[PDB]
């Protein structure tokens, strides 16, 4: 029903998914000039359970790791959130070359990829119901910058051989996503939507200022996945990112100061 191919990509989502036409769509372009510091933004923290990781999969649109969220195992709390959130899954977005691939951009700079750790509020009883709330989902977004190879990330990349084609999935346990977190927890926050259909505007975004580094080699591994089935002819899965959407009247807030634009 949707994808990143020229016939079902971002340019066509609006006529298939009404929400994609909304006023609080994601991603957006971040401009530090217009970002205001909000002392109310408290530090966020995680209580992830490595043993909660269950499956890794390739649905032809991205590669996703699923966690056990039947109860409060891996939690995300603090920050602008109204309560604790359950880690449900994480996936990535990347481009065809290292010069681009991230969905959000900062002051014109684009990254090679973007990691999204998706959580939801248990207060809404069910993940499906959380998608109906403006703050039902909280996503931790991490930028991937080209540089030194990442050892922790390599573990993830090593499992990719199991889900090369669309539809493939494999047991993937023992993995703490927090090991991929950069040293700084400074973040930007705003409210938007899923950057993928149905594009519900139900996400409270937490974008980390400090990017995660990865080597060009490791990025090449991500681009080796297929969006095609084991039968169908090979079709590489690259460019699974959505262009920036109009910010409209939304203001992005920072948990840190950044004195550059003022005094
Ligand atoms: Zn995403």
Curated annotation (Swiss-Prot):
Enzyme Commission no: 4.2.1.1
Localisation per UniProt entry: Cytoplasm
Pfam families documented for this protein: Carb_anhydrase
List of residues that carry Phosphotyrosine: 124
Post-translational modification (record): S-thiolated both by thiol-disulfide exchange with glutathione disulfide and by oxyradical-initiated S-thiolation with reduced glutathione. S-glutathionylated in hepatocytes under oxidative stress.
Any GO molecular function: nickel cation binding
UniProt: substrate binding residues: 195-196
In-chain residues carrying the UniProt-annotated modification S-glutathionyl cysteine: 179, 184
Main location: cytoplasm
Annotated keywords: Acetylation, Cytoplasm, Glutathionylation, Lyase, Metal-binding, Phosphoprotein, Zinc
Record-annotated Alpha-carbonic anhydrase domain positions: 1-256
Modified residues (Phosphothreonine): 70, 126, 173, 213
Activation and inhibition: Activated by proton donors such as imidazole and the dipeptide histidylhistidine. Inhibited by coumarins and sulfonamide derivatives such as acetazolamide.
Gene Ontology biological process terms in this record: response to bacterium; response to ethanol; response to oxidative stress
Modification Phosphoserine, positions: 26, 40, 45, 47, 52, 216
Cofactor(s) recorded in Swiss-Prot or TrEMBL: Zn(2+)
InterPro entries: CA_dom, CA_dom_sf, Carbonic_anhydrase_a-class, Carbonic_anhydrase_a-class_CS
SUPFAM superfamilies per UniProt: Carbonic anhydrase
Known catalytic reactions: hydrogencarbonate + H(+) = CO2 + H2O
EC class of the enzyme, as a word: lyase
Protein family per UniProt: Belongs to the alpha-carbonic anhydrase family.
Physiological role: Reversible hydration of carbon dioxide.
Name the record gives this protein: Carbonic anhydrase 3
Organism: Homo sapiens (Human)
